[PDB]
Design a protein around this ligand. Sequence first.
Ligand SMILES: [Tb+3]
Ligand SMILES: [Tb+3]
Length: 162
Amino acid sequence: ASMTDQQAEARAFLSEEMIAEFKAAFDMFDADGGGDISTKELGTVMRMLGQNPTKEELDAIIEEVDEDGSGTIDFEEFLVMMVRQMKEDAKGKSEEELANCFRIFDKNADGFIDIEELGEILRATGEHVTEEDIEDLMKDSDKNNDGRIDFDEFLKMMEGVQ
Ligand SMILES: [Tb+3]
Ligand SMILES: [Tb+3]
């Protein structure tokens, strides 16, 4: 994927109203209406739009878009960077949430979800889960056959593809 390719993919990723919303904030820092903003303001517009790049990340993006020394970033490149940051931030939040789900599932905090903990959480959902269904989920997620689900196995169980 080239940058035009990446740009089309970034646009495909977003709804048109979100793209417009992002351009409204972006344009507040254009002024000159060139379709670009100073790379100095990139962090500020990304943060106004709920993203949280690190300073190192910003320096990396800036260096990636500013190889000609213009000191600016255009809106299309901006959208590629925003989508990269969204995917990154979303992933981090998911990881965080799964870690929290695991310590809640593991009621006795021994670092594992056993079939009784698995059984109690699944029944607590109100679903008509049978013991056989719970046993089937345990068997299929317990990769090393020790009868319990540790955090690595839980991440695989939950993320599924994983
Ligand atoms: Tb446990
Ligand atoms: Tb296991």
